[PDB]
């Protein structure tokens, strides 16, 4: 009896874990892409300032 209950509960906990992870992944990917673009932008503005100052 215990084993059947434990395996079913293990299934559920892992299902919940992977759903929570997927939600975090989705949110972090958005932050990743924003940050990715912002680093290109920032870098480039620095080089352009460096060029204009000469």
């Amino acid at each position: 009896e215990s084993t059947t209950s434990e395996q079913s509960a293990r299934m559920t906990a892992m299902d919940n874990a992977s759903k929570n992870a997927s939600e975090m992944i989705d949110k972090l990917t958005l932050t990743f892409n924003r940050t990715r673009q912002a680093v290109i932008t920032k870098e480039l503005i620095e080089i352009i300032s460096g060029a204009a100052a000469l």
Binding site: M11, D15, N33, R34, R36, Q37, I40, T41, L44, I48
Partner: protein, 465 residues
């Protein structure tokens, strides 16, 4: 007659003593073995212009003579462009001699004015079941074609060309913007095999304009406009509904970015040109419905870094009236065309535009596929007999629904050995409505797979077993 005063890569400065060429004017460099066109970009002051070269600048000398042609780049327009390939400046690059046209046309035409606009949304019937039902195309609209290689993308483009000429009579233009040369050759020959291009007669349905990956950015930036110009003759002078393919929009934006950098302009967010949205806008706005006719445009879209918020796809997305999403997963299931029935979208999917009957069936087909997705996430974890009595009914219908979404293409007849089908909108609707109503629950799934109208879905079952 101007004289070259500076050359730095694809940027050439030219001095004129009296007749200064307006911005956008084409200039022809004298004493070169092949045609070298410079497009005026700026008036620098002191009778000097800055121009962008349409081909390589090697061998240019300061003092070398340059003629103002008196107008923008002008290209051949008319029926004799069909089945031909031209470059950005309208020269034939298919070694079949002169494009003997009775008219030429300038490539920087203004978009139609606000008064010229149609007040009404209207449907462009492709004859393709997935598209027409779930994500229909609009006349005068822009469609975003998503997906990489090996997903039947070239076969879909060719089918759209074939079906549009088959059903409406209208013509197609294909602008290859920054494509690999090898792929332009493949497409050319794939078009000859299918019959959309015919080298023996006048029955070609498409005109090609190519601006390859290895050409200067000025050339790659104007290819889309050259194609638009060819298209605009058919719409305006022949009063037609024309199809403009652009492959692809990312490279149009990329070349715009390079031209802006050549001119020494300060880059905007993520490296793109400051004029990103106006560059796009001046081009996309020429794709519209007017009173003489319409141009509809299918645009292959590449998404850098898988990032839909990247300024390039983000800017394009504003102009799109529909999306057609091609997927490997759908192809791996054996479904062709490999259109994702849930990820594809259309702005004209409104009861007032497509009709009450169209919207209901489409929203009903969309729902049952969404059910099938949630029902399949219970079978894999648990089992098939863990679901109710009504659950297996929605599965059986939805399996036949995705099979009646698949379609044999006319342009794919040479390879698979099966005859292709063009299905009217009315037969697509009433066919799908009958599956949801349950009128075909007594039939096997394989009867609905790779057929045309529902009359074939009934008859195929009789032939089998």
């Amino acid at each position: 007659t101007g004289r070259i005063v500076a050359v730095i890569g694809a940027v050439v400065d030219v001095q004129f003593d009296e007749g200064l060429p307006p911005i956008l004017n084409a200039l022809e460099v004298q004493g070169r073995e092949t045609r070298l066109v410079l497009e005026v970009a700026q008036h620098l002051g002191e009778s000097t212009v800055r121009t962008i070269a349409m081909d390589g600048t090697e061998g240019l000398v300061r003092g070398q003579k340059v003629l103002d042609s008196g107008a923008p780049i002008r290209i051949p327009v008319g029926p004799e462009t069909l089945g031909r390939i031209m470059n950005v400046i309208g020269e034939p690059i298919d070694e079949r001699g002169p494009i003997k046209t009775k008219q030429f046309a300038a490539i920087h035409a203004e978009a139609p004015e606000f008064v010229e606009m149609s007040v009404e949304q209207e449907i462009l019937v492709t004859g393709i079941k997935v598209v027409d039902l779930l994500a229909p195309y609009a006349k005068g609209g822009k469609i975003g074609l998503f997906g990489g290689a090996g997903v039947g993308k070239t076969v879909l483009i060719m089918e759209l060309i074939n079906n549009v000429a088959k059903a409406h009579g209208g013509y197609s233009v294909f602008a290859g913007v920054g494509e690999r040369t090898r792929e332009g050759n493949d497409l050319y020959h794939e078009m000859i095999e299918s019959g959309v291009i015919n080298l023996k007669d006048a029955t070609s349905k498409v005109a090609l304009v190519y601006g390859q990956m290895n050409e200067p950015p000025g050339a790659r930036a104007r290819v889309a406009l050259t194609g638009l110009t060819v298209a605009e003759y058919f719409r305006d002078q022949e009063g037609q509904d024309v199809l403009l393919f652009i492959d692809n929009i990312f490279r149009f934006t990329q070349a715009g970015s390079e031209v802006s950098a050549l001119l020494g302009r300060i880059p905007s967010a993520v490296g793109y040109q400051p004029t990103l949205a106006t560059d796009m806008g001046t081009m996309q706005e020429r794709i519209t419905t007017t009173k003489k006719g319409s141009i509809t445009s299918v645009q292959a879209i590449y998404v850098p870094a898988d990032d839909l918020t990247d300024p390039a796809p983000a800017t394009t997305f504003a102009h799109l009236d529909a999306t057609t999403v091609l997927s490997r997963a759908i192809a791996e299931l054996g479904i062709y065309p490999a259109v994702d029935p849930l990820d594809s979208t259309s702005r004209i999917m409104d009861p007032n535009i497509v009709g009450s009957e169209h919207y209901d069936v489409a929203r009903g087909v969309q729902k049952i596929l969404q059910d099938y997705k949630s029902l399949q996430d219970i079978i894999a974890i648990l089992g098939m007999d863990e679901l109710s009595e009504e659950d297996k009914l929605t599965v059986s219908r939805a399996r036949k629904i995705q099979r009646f979404l698949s379609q044999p293409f006319q342009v794919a007849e040479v390879f698979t050995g099966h005859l292709g089908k063009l299905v009217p909108l009315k037969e697509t609707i009433k066919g799908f409505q009958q599956i949801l109503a349950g009128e075909y629950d007594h039939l096997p799934e394989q009867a609905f797979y790779m057929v045309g109208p529902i009359e074939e879905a009934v008859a195929k079952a009789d032939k089998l077993a």
